[PDB]
Design a protein around this ligand. Structure first.
Ligand SMILES: Cc1cc2nc3c(=O)[nH]c(=O)nc-3n(C[C@H](O)[C@H](O)[C@H](O)COP(=O)(O)OP(=O)(O)OC[C@H]3O[C@@H](n4cnc5c(N)ncnc54)[C@H](O)[C@@H]3O)c2cc1C
Ligand SMILES: Cc1cc2nc3c(=O)[nH]c(=O)nc-3n(C[C@H](O)[C@H](O)[C@H](O)COP(=O)(O)OP(=O)(O)OC[C@H]3O[C@@H](n4cnc5c(N)ncnc54)[C@H](O)[C@@H]3O)c2cc1C
Ligand SMILES: CC(=O)Nc1cccc(NC(=O)CN(C)S(=O)(=O)c2cc(C)cc(C(F)F)c2)c1
Ligand SMILES: CC(=O)Nc1cccc(NC(=O)CN(C)S(=O)(=O)c2cc(C)cc(C(F)F)c2)c1
Lengths: 464, 464
């Protein structure tokens, strides 16, 4: 029944960063994790997927663009080597998490935690033992799990991201349920490695959380890649027949069968809230079955916090880390700053072209009553995008007309995920388009498209 | 004869942007240019060089990283096709400038302008003949020319960037005089296309304007590429023997002869100040033979401005454009913002890894009496850099300890030229390290390294 100021449940990006921050602030800290040090993100998520996406991008270059770059010769690509590299990358970063745990003198507890009451955690140790731990504060960082299409089940040929990303061998053909970031990214990797890919989306646009202009562009790019995207299409049932999987869908009010060797379920993620005594701690769930929190990540139990995907606010790694910092700082009574409207946080999808966005879409800002101004600059007017060989896409900024404060930003193009920091910095610290347009951007860079958008928000664009 | 509110001399990025902004402000504008619409940058500079650099980077990726990416096959690369694409990119961007001039109702005058007095310009027209233009304001935007090693001359095998970048065929070997951005970029392109490359630099490090830690890292990567860099070495003579060029260099009083098929002179650029009647307009030069200007780009003649490389302040394209906007706004009496100390402006070099920086180096900040705080984050601790396959390099931020105000930032790594905007926005609008550390950066991106540097400036890094 050892005692810690802080016990962290789960060691994904939210949990292990919260534990570092608590340790930095002088708090005795323990973190409890049975399986994934670094969580989903480092083991089977962000880290390995970005390695596989880079490999896929190089296939797409040394295949579709070789002639235009003066590259000649018969090239072959081996997905197994891409897989192997992704696992070595993941393993190196996981070893990093353990290094940081030791550097900060955080106690690792290798097992699964169940609450006995608001201040007691019982742990089933990976070695078979059972141990108890008490705490002054708890940080729940237990993540989310894949949501299955209602009525369907997993099987040999019907998999979540986890089994798919851990496969060294690819199928001949796949059907991906869900056109969010995960489904689109897997579609990009598999199609470039020669898998027939169909992506099925219930809403009428791929990447339906994005601005509709962005959805339209990414649909066009994926069609050119040879991916079939079926939008406004409901998956009714999934039947694993062994040698093929049959997906029954409704589209245009008509039931139709699609067949493939494999099916990836990627329709969303549900917070992990069952099976570890949240009820014994007294912790309340929202109507959506996420752990409710306030702006300081506090649950309804004042000394128990919930960070990362388990609160369902914005299920991304940098959000989990930032929420972990807020919780640790709030526990310690240190100066913190809350995150505010989580819609303003940045996010990206790492197919090529990238999609990167923050804040409100143009349609959302109009619906919420802002006096909306929009500036859109296409990368066909950017010198760097032509030099790199990919002038597709654009930057679209949405601002409020009273002072030119930013409401959102929507980017699609080559490597645009790196371009968000200046925009979220301005939004957070109340710099307007008039201040942003005076910030000189290096030439020739993709980032010059930001500066032309600022000009268009305040007056007239120059190089457009 | 014909009269304009504003006449712009030269149509590089400085001139043609100044003319657009003057036009936007309602001033009747003409722009005089004999040869390069888009100037050096769009025709023989930034635009085609970044196209060649992308081709070279794809050679490097296959050549050194093919095996690790699972790519097999005997591949050849044809520099001729890189060359052809660089010209097509340049020609499209020049057509763009012409579209912008007509969209903004700017009069193009196709010829070479000479001042007759402080309000009259004589134009020798390309189509034969002479026209006289009078003006109320003039913007001199006449650029710079290559400085040669004293006593040397151009010949068939001794060239500037202009003849070299217009060459469709490559030599077997080359000596590059000067390890500035231009010399390093050509060295990167030519070495990747199989040329034996030696770069000779008078100062004791390559990219000597950069922070010494950045120079050390780029020298290391170039040595791994196989480029010989000779630092603290003075070129004293260049003798073109037709079949070979002999370059005599000295270091520590010892002389040595270097031989190669070709020599590229890239030791610097001198403002263009002779031969177009500056004396007749009354415009004064600095001791270094640049046109002297104040903070609003005005020469000693109050209604004559000088922008871009001809004022020698910081000979970069985005600087020329920014100075053009200031000059045009000042002429019109519009609200403007001076650029201040030009050392704070951003700059980048586009070999791989990129180098990108702004502001003071750590040593310059120490020498000027700041209370210097430094934070350095290596890309070996960045998840995106490992996924991309290039974890080399770092981000190094220099701040003042009183409030955490940024003094400079120095980046070397994969595609880091895109990461400067947040740093220069914060420096310009007085956001300190403690405001920057709260800006959430998307995961996994190279930009997360910025956020970790902010944490180190205000406290302790988390993921390092
Ligand atoms: C394929 C894929 C790609 C992704 N790519 C990105 C991307 O590029 N960028 C991005 O920002 N996000 C990405 N994500 C999302 C990202 O993985 C999650 O947002 C992130 O991992 C959430 O972190 P977390 O700490 O909240 O939870 P998790 O990383 O899910 O970690 C929670 C941990 O809690 C442990 N746990 C659960 N219950 C208990 C218990 N009772 N006791 C002890 N431990 C317990 C689990 O074992 C798990 O390791 C991706 C996700 C997937 C699936
Ligand atoms: C190989 C190379 C690569 C470069 N890469 C980059 C890069 O990546 N990023 C960057 O920011 N900078 C880069 N530069 C520098 C960039 O090219 C210059 O800073 C930029 O061109 C300066 O713009 P400017 O308008 O001052 O002058 P210029 O572009 O030199 O244009 C001046 C124009 O004035 C005209 N002119 C001269 N005298 C007269 C006259 N009397 N009458 C009429 N017209 C006249 C000339 O014909 C010319 O077209 C590079 C330069 C080179 C050589
Ligand atoms: C002093 C010293 O040697 N320290 C050291 C040693 C070994 C490893 C590490 N650090 C890592 O391994 C960093 N990783 C854990 S990470 O997956 O790259 C990652 C993950 C996340 C969520 C966010 C980032 C963000 F920072 F980019 C990076 C530090
Ligand atoms: C409404 C409409 O149809 N407009 C249109 C049509 C055709 C072309 C263009 N514009 C260009 O071609 C832009 N170029 C000239 S540029 O070389 O790319 C360039 C150069 C510099 C110095 C800086 C940038 C910076 F913006 F990135 C870009 C506009």
């Amino acid at each position: 029944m050892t005692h810690y100021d802080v016990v962290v449940l789960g060691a994904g990006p939210g949990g292990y960063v919260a534990a570092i921050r608590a340790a930095q602030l002088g708090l005795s800290t323990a973190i409890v994790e049975p399986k994934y040090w670094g969580g989903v993100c480092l083991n089977v998520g962000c880290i390995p997927s970005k390695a596989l996406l880079r490999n896929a991008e190089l296939v797409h270059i040394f295949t579709k663009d070789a002639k235009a770059f003066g590259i000649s010769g018969e090239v072959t690509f081996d997905y197994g080597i891409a897989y192997d590299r992704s696992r070595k990358v993941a393993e190196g970063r996981v070893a990093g998490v353990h290094f940081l745990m030791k550097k900060n003198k955080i106690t690792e507890i290798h097992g699964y935690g169940t609450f006995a009451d608001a201040n007691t955690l019982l742990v089933d140790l990976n070695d078979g033992g059972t141990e108890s731990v008490t705490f002054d504060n708890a940080i729940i960082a237990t993540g989310s799990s894949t949501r299955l299409v209602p009525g369907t089940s997993l099987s040999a040929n019907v998999v979540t991201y986890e089994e798919q990303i851990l496969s060294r061998e690819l199928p001949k053909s796949i059907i991906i349920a869900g056109a969010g970031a995960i489904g689109m990214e897997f579609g990009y990797v598999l199609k470039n490695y020669g898998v027939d890919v169909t992506i099925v989306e219930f809403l009428p646009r791929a990447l339906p959380n994005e601005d509709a202009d962005v959805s339209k562009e990414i649909e066009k790019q994926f069609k050119k890649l040879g991916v079939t995207i079926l939008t406004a299409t409901k998956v009714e049932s999934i039947a694993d027949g062994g040698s093929q999987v049959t997906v029954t869908v409704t589209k245009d009010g008509v039931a139709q069968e699609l067949k493939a060797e494999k099916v990836l379920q990627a329709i969303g993620f549900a917070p992990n809230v069952e099976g570890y005594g949240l009820d014994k701690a007294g912790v309340a769930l929202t109507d959506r079955k996420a752990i409710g929190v306030d702006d300081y990540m506090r649950t309804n139990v004042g000394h128990i916090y919930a960070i990362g995907d388990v609160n369902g606010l914005l299920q991304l790694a940098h959000v989990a880390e930032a929420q972990g910092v807020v919780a640790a700082e709030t526990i310690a009574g240190a100066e913190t700053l809350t995150l505010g409207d989580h819609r303003m946080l940045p996010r990206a999808t790492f197919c090529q072209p990238n999609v990167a966005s923050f804040g409100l879409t143009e349609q959302q800002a109009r619906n919420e009553g802002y006096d909306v101004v929009v500036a859109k600059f296409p990368f066909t007017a950017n010198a760097k995008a032509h030099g790199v060989g990919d002038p597709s896409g654009f930057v679209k900024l949405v601002a409020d007309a009273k002072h030119g404060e930013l409401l959102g930003g929507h980017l699609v193009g080559h490597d645009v995920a790196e371009l968000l920091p200046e925009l979220t910095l301005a939004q957070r610290w109340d710099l307007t388009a008039s201040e942003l347009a005076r910030n000189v951007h290096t030439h020739p860079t993709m980032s010059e498209a930001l500066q032309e958008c600022f000009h268009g928000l305040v007056g007239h664009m120059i190089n457009f």
